[PDB]
Amino acid sequence: SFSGYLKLTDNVYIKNADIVEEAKKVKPTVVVNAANVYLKHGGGVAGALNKATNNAMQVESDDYIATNGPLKVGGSCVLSGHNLAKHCLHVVGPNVNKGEDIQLLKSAYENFNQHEVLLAPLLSAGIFGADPIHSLRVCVDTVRTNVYLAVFDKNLYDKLVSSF
Ligand SMILES: O=C(O)C[C@@H](NC(=O)c1ccc2[nH]ccc2n1)c1ccc(Br)cc1
């Protein structure tokens, strides 16, 4: 049901699209959220996915944190996808703006290997402060399952394809 993606490798595909709109259209088995360790979905991809769920993602996430405590940087948890997907895989890439180790980006993408197919954003990109060209390279060199990357910014999308 994914359509219009450009094939980068055997298993990695990419499209200039809003991941919220893509999830509403496709209703994938798994949508990846660019989460923080507290599952506080304020802004970026997380704020946008949460708003699309009418804040149900944040209510579920606060119950998960109250029970389990925070995730690790490089870690993940599987929660409901609400109206966007069957499941949401909340993955914590390092936030370089907040001082986290960029080597944890490969650990973050390893979480995707537990799922056969995913709709995802580039981890640690945008407000997380990392170089998106580097994030795409770690993605293609780490993930073995089928990943459909949605890149919101048109100019970044064009740069990512032309420099790949
Ligand atoms: O373009 C990408 O997908 C990376 C992107 N991410 C966001 O910050 C980002 C933020 C909010 C969003 N809502 C749905 C999606 C989404 N994404 C980013 C945007 C612009 C620049 Br300039 C650099 C990076």
mmCIF file of C-alpha atoms in Angstrom, residues 13-117:
data_model
loop_
_atom_site.group_PDB
_atom_site.id
_atom_site.type_symbol
_atom_site.label_atom_id
_atom_site.label_comp_id
_atom_site.label_asym_id
_atom_site.label_seq_id
_atom_site.Cartn_x
_atom_site.Cartn_y
_atom_site.Cartn_z
ATOM 1 C CA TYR A 13 12.697 3.522 0.135
ATOM 2 C CA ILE A 14 12.187 7.303 0.436
ATOM 3 C CA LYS A 15 9.505 9.904 -0.324
ATOM 4 C CA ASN A 16 8.974 13.664 0.238
ATOM 5 C CA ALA A 17 5.880 13.416 2.446
ATOM 6 C CA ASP A 18 4.408 14.319 5.784
ATOM 7 C CA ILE A 19 4.618 11.104 7.863
ATOM 8 C CA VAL A 20 1.269 11.958 9.541
ATOM 9 C CA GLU A 21 -0.490 12.204 6.178
ATOM 10 C CA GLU A 22 1.277 9.076 4.945
ATOM 11 C CA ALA A 23 0.218 7.128 8.061
ATOM 12 C CA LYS A 24 -3.410 8.309 7.710
ATOM 13 C CA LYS A 25 -3.499 7.175 4.101
ATOM 14 C CA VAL A 26 -1.612 3.873 4.345
ATOM 15 C CA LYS A 27 -2.503 2.777 7.916
ATOM 16 C CA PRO A 28 0.771 0.755 8.123
ATOM 17 C CA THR A 29 1.432 -2.020 10.581
ATOM 18 C CA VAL A 30 4.128 0.117 12.207
ATOM 19 C CA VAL A 31 4.748 3.857 12.203
ATOM 20 C CA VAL A 32 8.013 5.002 13.882
ATOM 21 C CA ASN A 33 7.935 7.996 16.202
ATOM 22 C CA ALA A 34 11.049 10.157 16.766
ATOM 23 C CA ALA A 35 10.623 9.989 20.512
ATOM 24 C CA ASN A 36 12.542 11.310 23.515
ATOM 25 C CA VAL A 37 13.237 9.149 26.602
ATOM 26 C CA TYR A 38 10.272 10.629 28.493
ATOM 27 C CA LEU A 39 7.828 10.059 25.609
ATOM 28 C CA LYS A 40 6.931 13.792 25.796
ATOM 29 C CA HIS A 41 5.560 14.370 22.303
ATOM 30 C CA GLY A 42 5.805 18.165 22.119
ATOM 31 C CA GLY A 43 7.206 19.003 18.752
ATOM 32 C CA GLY A 44 8.777 17.694 15.594
ATOM 33 C CA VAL A 45 7.498 14.357 14.277
ATOM 34 C CA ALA A 46 6.369 13.335 17.811
ATOM 35 C CA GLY A 47 4.285 16.491 18.348
ATOM 36 C CA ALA A 48 2.678 16.039 14.908
ATOM 37 C CA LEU A 49 1.869 12.300 15.358
ATOM 38 C CA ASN A 50 0.468 12.946 18.831
ATOM 39 C CA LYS A 51 -1.748 15.848 17.595
ATOM 40 C CA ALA A 52 -3.139 13.533 14.881
ATOM 41 C CA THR A 53 -4.189 11.083 17.645
ATOM 42 C CA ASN A 54 -6.052 13.867 19.494
ATOM 43 C CA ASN A 55 -3.479 13.465 22.376
ATOM 44 C CA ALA A 56 -4.349 9.756 22.882
ATOM 45 C CA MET A 57 -0.683 8.883 22.126
ATOM 46 C CA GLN A 58 0.473 11.191 24.971
ATOM 47 C CA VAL A 59 -2.090 9.757 27.456
ATOM 48 C CA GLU A 60 -0.949 6.210 26.644
ATOM 49 C CA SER A 61 2.712 7.280 26.799
ATOM 50 C CA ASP A 62 2.332 8.919 30.246
ATOM 51 C CA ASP A 63 0.819 5.671 31.593
ATOM 52 C CA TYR A 64 3.777 3.702 30.060
ATOM 53 C CA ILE A 65 6.354 6.034 31.678
ATOM 54 C CA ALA A 66 4.528 5.979 35.061
ATOM 55 C CA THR A 67 4.849 2.147 34.997
ATOM 56 C CA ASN A 68 8.270 1.600 33.356
ATOM 57 C CA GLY A 69 10.305 4.784 33.730
ATOM 58 C CA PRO A 70 12.095 6.426 30.812
ATOM 59 C CA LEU A 71 13.545 4.730 27.763
ATOM 60 C CA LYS A 72 17.295 4.677 27.071
ATOM 61 C CA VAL A 73 18.771 6.861 24.291
ATOM 62 C CA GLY A 74 19.071 4.305 21.445
ATOM 63 C CA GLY A 75 16.073 2.329 22.807
ATOM 64 C CA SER A 76 12.448 1.860 21.873
ATOM 65 C CA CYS A 77 9.051 0.647 22.996
ATOM 66 C CA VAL A 78 6.010 -0.597 21.057
ATOM 67 C CA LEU A 79 2.721 1.141 21.853
ATOM 68 C CA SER A 80 -0.610 1.534 20.010
ATOM 69 C CA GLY A 81 -0.676 3.290 16.623
ATOM 70 C CA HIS A 82 -4.162 4.687 17.457
ATOM 71 C CA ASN A 83 -5.818 6.015 14.255
ATOM 72 C CA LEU A 84 -2.471 6.089 12.349
ATOM 73 C CA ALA A 85 -1.148 2.515 12.363
ATOM 74 C CA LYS A 86 -1.588 -0.829 14.146
ATOM 75 C CA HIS A 87 1.490 -0.021 16.293
ATOM 76 C CA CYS A 88 3.768 2.918 16.977
ATOM 77 C CA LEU A 89 7.415 2.046 17.517
ATOM 78 C CA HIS A 90 8.746 4.931 19.701
ATOM 79 C CA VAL A 91 12.488 5.132 18.962
ATOM 80 C CA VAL A 92 14.928 7.435 20.738
ATOM 81 C CA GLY A 93 17.720 8.683 18.538
ATOM 82 C CA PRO A 94 20.427 10.827 20.174
ATOM 83 C CA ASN A 95 19.627 14.527 20.444
ATOM 84 C CA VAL A 96 22.916 16.265 19.545
ATOM 85 C CA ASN A 97 21.389 19.652 20.681
ATOM 86 C CA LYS A 98 20.935 18.240 24.173
ATOM 87 C CA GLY A 99 24.525 16.695 24.149
ATOM 88 C CA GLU A 100 23.923 13.000 23.342
ATOM 89 C CA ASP A 101 26.371 10.598 21.696
ATOM 90 C CA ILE A 102 25.852 10.352 17.901
ATOM 91 C CA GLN A 103 27.250 6.756 18.026
ATOM 92 C CA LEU A 104 23.886 5.814 19.577
ATOM 93 C CA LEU A 105 22.179 6.471 16.211
ATOM 94 C CA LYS A 106 23.155 3.016 14.927
ATOM 95 C CA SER A 107 21.663 1.459 18.121
ATOM 96 C CA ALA A 108 18.479 3.452 17.558
ATOM 97 C CA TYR A 109 18.070 2.146 13.973
ATOM 98 C CA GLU A 110 18.698 -1.476 15.151
ATOM 99 C CA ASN A 111 15.239 -1.306 16.758
ATOM 100 C CA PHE A 112 13.736 -1.261 13.255
ATOM 101 C CA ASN A 113 15.060 -4.797 12.610
ATOM 102 C CA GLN A 114 12.449 -6.258 14.973
ATOM 103 C CA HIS A 115 9.662 -5.313 12.441
ATOM 104 C CA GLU A 116 9.260 -6.597 8.874
ATOM 105 C CA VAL A 117 8.048 -3.296 7.447
#
